[PDB]
Symmetry: none
Subunit: 307 residues, 4 copies
Amino acid sequence: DAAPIKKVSVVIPVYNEQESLPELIRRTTTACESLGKAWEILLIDDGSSDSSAELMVKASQEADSHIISILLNRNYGQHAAIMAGFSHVSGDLIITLDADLQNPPEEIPRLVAKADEGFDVVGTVRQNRQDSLFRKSASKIINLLIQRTTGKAMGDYGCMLRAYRRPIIDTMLRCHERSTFIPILANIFARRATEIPVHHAESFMRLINLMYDLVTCLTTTPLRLLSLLGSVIAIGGFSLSVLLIVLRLALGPQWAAEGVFMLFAVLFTFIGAQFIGMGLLGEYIGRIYNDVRARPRYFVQQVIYPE
Amino acid sequence: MFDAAPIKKVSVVIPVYNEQESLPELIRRTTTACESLGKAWEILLIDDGSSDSSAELMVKASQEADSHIISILLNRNYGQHAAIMAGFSHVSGDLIITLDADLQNPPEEIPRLVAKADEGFDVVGTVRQNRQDSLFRKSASKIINLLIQRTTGKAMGDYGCMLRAYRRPIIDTMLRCHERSTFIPILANIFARRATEIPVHHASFMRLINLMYDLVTCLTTTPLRLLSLLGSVIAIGGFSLSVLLIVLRLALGPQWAAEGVFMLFAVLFTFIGAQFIGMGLLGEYIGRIYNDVRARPRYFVQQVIYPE
Amino acid sequence: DAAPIKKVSVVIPVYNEQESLPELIRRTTTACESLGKAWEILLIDDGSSDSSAELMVKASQEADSHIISILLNRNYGQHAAIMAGFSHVSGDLIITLDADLQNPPEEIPRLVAKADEGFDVVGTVRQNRQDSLFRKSASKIINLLIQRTTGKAMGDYGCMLRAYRRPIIDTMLRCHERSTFIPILANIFARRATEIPVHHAESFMRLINLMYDLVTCLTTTPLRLLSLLGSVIAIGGFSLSVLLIVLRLALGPQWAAEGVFMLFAVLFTFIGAQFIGMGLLGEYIGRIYNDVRARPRYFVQQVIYPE
Amino acid sequence: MFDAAPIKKVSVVIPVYNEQESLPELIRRTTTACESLGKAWEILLIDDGSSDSSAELMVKASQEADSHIISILLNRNYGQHAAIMAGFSHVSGDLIITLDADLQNPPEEIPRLVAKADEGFDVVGTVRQNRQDSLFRKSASKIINLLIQRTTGKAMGDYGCMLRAYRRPIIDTMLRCHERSTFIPILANIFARRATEIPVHHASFMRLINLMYDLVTCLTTTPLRLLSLLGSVIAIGGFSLSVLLIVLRLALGPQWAAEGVFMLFAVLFTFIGAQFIGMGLLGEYIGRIYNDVRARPRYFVQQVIYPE
């Protein structure tokens, strides 16, 4: 059971897209007109160096237009532009769309219908996605990680053609997390989420940076793993210490030498102590990071009090 | 302080996760025990996003005529702690009993807790007897008991079983704590005036390390303090020895093996001590931050008397 | 310029003082009556095991009495009892007093007069304090640390006979800091603070714990010192590494040996790297700790706009 | 984006701390420069808890007939940054100029900044020419310039002098940042659209380390990331070498010196790598916490156009 959707706000972050902006505006206008609802398109200029801002202003200033141009003084990123657009939306359902026509605007009605069934978040999965197998492995491993963390299974993450209900946008704006990935945050705050299949027209350090960013946004489990591996390495260090100095010194004084072995067996327990301390610091940092975000402890779905 | 309020209603909180195999037997036994109590009772079954037909059984049990069962369905799995907290958020009785859903703790022990809660105890835990296990696990349980005794003061031995009784003020105070992934019995013992235990008869190493890491955050906010002391002596000797071998002895003190090797030893130990002191300072500041962010309530006011 | 003081609330944390409550209540009642203002005494029972709670209740239930008894279900500490009392005060000026008659209640009027001059906080310094010289060393070093940190010079800290204005109490209750020492917090939030001299009737691990607690509450300077000393130790480690293996290897191969010197000069640079990393973590932790507390950046005392 | 607003009022912010020796000359020179500007002007003198008679001089200057001086007195010392922020909280002009109170930067350079701010620059910094110092200090200044160029993008060379010009929107955005003990020019460059510098002619190693530690928090939130990579290689080799010396070679591979010594060597670098990776993970989580707690504004909206 969900409130009926009366207005759709399309948020499009624009950055140096002067050659695609007219076609995007025309296609998005046609798609939104083919809805039978109040609609508006929020174009956000992320400090474009080209004539994108002039085209946005001309589109906004046209006769009987539904386009809102939000100009940022400089470049801030897709996330900051999308949140700036979220801060100015007025519709019941907010659709995030690519500005480079990778995701066709004609898929917009299909999302809206799916949002009418009572889904807070309606993601899209791109069919027949052709790319390197390494990115495919990354896609499946991040899918499994998000499924185990947030519960709601999310497939394609690079496609930001998504639908959110207004309460989800309001919660995300009022949330204590700032740099977190918006689809992940929506899945975290979603009551009911789903996905639909869509058809898409078209380094290595960046991939590792994205992996670290997503793992840190989702869970603190890696901190617990660090603590556990630190405990294990510390136990190994104490075992090597007792084995090397205490036993082999009693067995062979000359064999275990005078210089190198014994006091560095003593060194090995100090590295174990350092690992245990770092694990305790990690535990406390994880608790702090969980508490500051103040994500909901649970969502009750239905309570069935008897007669 | 002013004695204890009489117990009029008992709320049983049972977190359920994929327990369709034993759910009917659990419901029947818990209903029989609560009917034998002789007070108003209710059973809060919480579905923690079960994949099986547990939710359907809970709905059928709640919808049955003249039933005292409340079904709380969660959209997905959040864990036993989150399900128990969700159940706490919906209780209405004076005494709240947490019970296992896998029939490890027999529901027929419920009256014995309630009678103990009638003596004026805020928390009534259970300790399992005839528990056969490794002596190592028993030693671990005993040392955890001793640590919690030293920390919270209240006498509370066994934490393996979650069959426990809390008074409504303790539950209300715990609900005001927005800590995520805490340990419920420790939090109860923090705000409890008089806690006790009763004996019950029930039917790896990485786990112990995980439990120790979980409990250490709940018990104290600054373990690394001790490490700083352990660092300081390693620094002081690491300095006191170092100069003593050269600053006193240049040409008279090459000694039998090597003075340079023992300088490597001493300066390395001094660096180890400095590293320990740094970790202690980091821990101090992190503990302060954690205590401020946790925002746990500082006290529980029992009664305020205003003059006429 | 300050608002006039019309009501005085005395907050007295009580813990196992059943032999002191009658005399303390009588003397505090006489002192508060000798004021010509509305007064009230908040006695807080910190889970006393003796008959203290019964005496507090009898005092509160007497004819035309001004005593409020706040009973805590168990022991929580002097700080928690004082904050519980602060949560229930109603007067303009709040006076914290010892329950064991160490600070005579007859000093209460002298504080109130000093609070009438327009001071937010009026502390007391104990004269002719006879004790071990080591406590004197601790007293002066903590005085200098508090003076350099909070600006307002504060002497005796063990004497909690203090006066606070109601806005200071409200700010302390609404503050984000929880376990901080109350006189230090009052000096931090005070606009104008002062001290008056008073006459008082009468291990080692605890002292170092209190030193660590006060240093951590006041400043993050020790974190910067840790970073600086870590940088210095790291530079020393790199210097020792280059000196011991790189140079002495080329000078004497047999003299500098094979096992113990070379590889472990290589160890020394990793020790320095660990120190630098720990210092950088400390810098970020200090920034977090400063930002979460959200202490005021400045207090403007007077603005003198021209004609 | 839509060109730049005209400049109608200039506010000069001067943090004062025990500067009674040069305060009258500074006031006279700044008044002359601002009168020569040809716009509405005001001088905000901020007394940062001076122990000398600086406050009395500022009060006399503010109380003088037909004076454009605003005296803001602070009860105690809070630092130059807090005094400058307090001055920012009271400005009313379109362009805000921060100026040294010790006459290191001549006030006669004020018009040259304003004219540059008339070309449409949000931030107009100053770089000092004919600056004679150690080549080491010059290299430090240049590498800091390069790091800030790579981080914030805006071209901003010299940060030693605080003689700078900011547009009112930049000051307003900076006031919405509740960060404590940040670096003001870096924060301005973060929100600035077009920043520039002009040349001016002005009249230890622990310091450099302190400045680097101060700037590293403002520039990035996760330096330790790189250390984690440096750890990972030390781990992988620390593993790859270790087994290769024994798991391949038991009796054929004692080798010339010692296989056990090289085992201690290899497992030691394995532990060092693990420690680096742990410090990297701690840094990642601490950086996330710091970024969330800082709550810096994510963007500055320049104009919103609504359709008719």
